[PDB]
Amino acid sequence: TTPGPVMLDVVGTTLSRDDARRLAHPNTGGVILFARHFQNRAQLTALTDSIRAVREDILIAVDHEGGRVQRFRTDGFTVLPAMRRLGELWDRDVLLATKVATAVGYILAAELRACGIDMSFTPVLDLDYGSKVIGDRAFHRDPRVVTLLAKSLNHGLSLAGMANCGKHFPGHGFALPTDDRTLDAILEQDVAPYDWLGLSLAAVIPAHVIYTQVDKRPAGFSRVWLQDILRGKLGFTGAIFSDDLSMEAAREGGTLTQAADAALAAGCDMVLVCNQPDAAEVVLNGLKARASAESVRRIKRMRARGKALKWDKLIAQPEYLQAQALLSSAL
Ligand SMILES: CCC(CC)C(=O)N[C@H]1/C(=N/OC(=O)Nc2ccccc2)O[C@H](CO)[C@@H](O)[C@@H]1O
């Protein structure tokens, strides 16, 4: 009853017999939700409940960053702003920006927790260099601003008992994309938020980027980035999730199973295989690596903390209503 290294997804709004088989697999350790898994809050809450009934130790995550990346947007879910908005608020009022960032984090996490979800793959720590796929998903250009805005956000997530996951290490702001900058330049700017956050950073997603001047391998498959730099230089002790291995160029010509074993060997504690459960099931049965005691420890600390308010109580909570007003007033 310990988490496995694979995070996959399920078939739809309710669990099928095939989902139950996959969830019960020892190498399964997480479920990532998408828009297709949300009809309404009642259905979503029932799904997460049924997932934990099959596998009590499972980690349930979702991409809730705000702006362009928010899977659940209806039936009462607060539409959250793009993180770039907070960087814009910082430039006009630093202290207010931190205050709002916390309110955004609390709403974000409180609403997910009311529906039985453990965590969100947020914040994005990539610097806003001016990448269309990142775009307004980044907080700011200045790594010191990204750090303190992200720190304030993760604080709000923590108020609801929710962890966090910075991405995409060591920096996606600047076949698989390449980055021909030197280690020093990458460290001095893009990595700085990861280092400065300290214990405020609970997990990392490495980017599917070749940092040519640093290592032949992508960050997610790089022992240099993950072991030497992230765990070694930065002393990071949190969980490392691979970025979606379903990307064509991520496999580098190999199978999903080989890419999964490579990421886990490089330093990943858990691999993501999204939008193809049958392919993820092949990985479950073909994976050579098994969850270690130290990886299990890190995965377990990503679970949500404490009791969550049900939706009917949350929307009338003073703190919740205070966050809403602050968000409405500042943006
Ligand atoms: C720097 C942007 C980067 C871009 C990589 C990105 O946005 N990465 C996201 C991602 N993207 O996953 C695919 O792009 N998969 C795909 C896309 C097209 C076809 C098949 C699979 O994965 C995980 C799991 O959701 C997210 O938390 C990541 O933030």
Report d(CA 188, CA 90) in Å as an integer: 21
Give the number of the atom of ligand 1 that is nearest the alpha carbon of residue 165.
27
Closest CA to 191 of 232, 158, 163, 250: 232
Q: Residue 204 in contact with residue 230, Cβ under 8 Å? A: yes
Tell me the CATH number at 228: 3.20.20.300
Closest CA to 315 of 75, 151, 48: 75
How far does the centroid of ligand 1 lie from the alpha carbon of residue 322, in Å?
33
Give the number of the atom of ligand 1 that is nearest the alpha carbon of residue 34.
25
Reported structure resolution in angstroms: 2.2
How far does the centroid of ligand 1 lie from the alpha carbon of residue 274, in Å?
9
Backbone angles phi, psi at 28, to 5 degrees: -85, 135
Closest CA to 63 of 164, 202, 135, 159: 164
Q: Residue 54 in contact with residue 46, Cβ under 8 Å? A: no
**Residue 89 belongs to domain spanning:** 1-331
The number of domains in the chain is: 1
Residue holding tokens 């929710």? 162
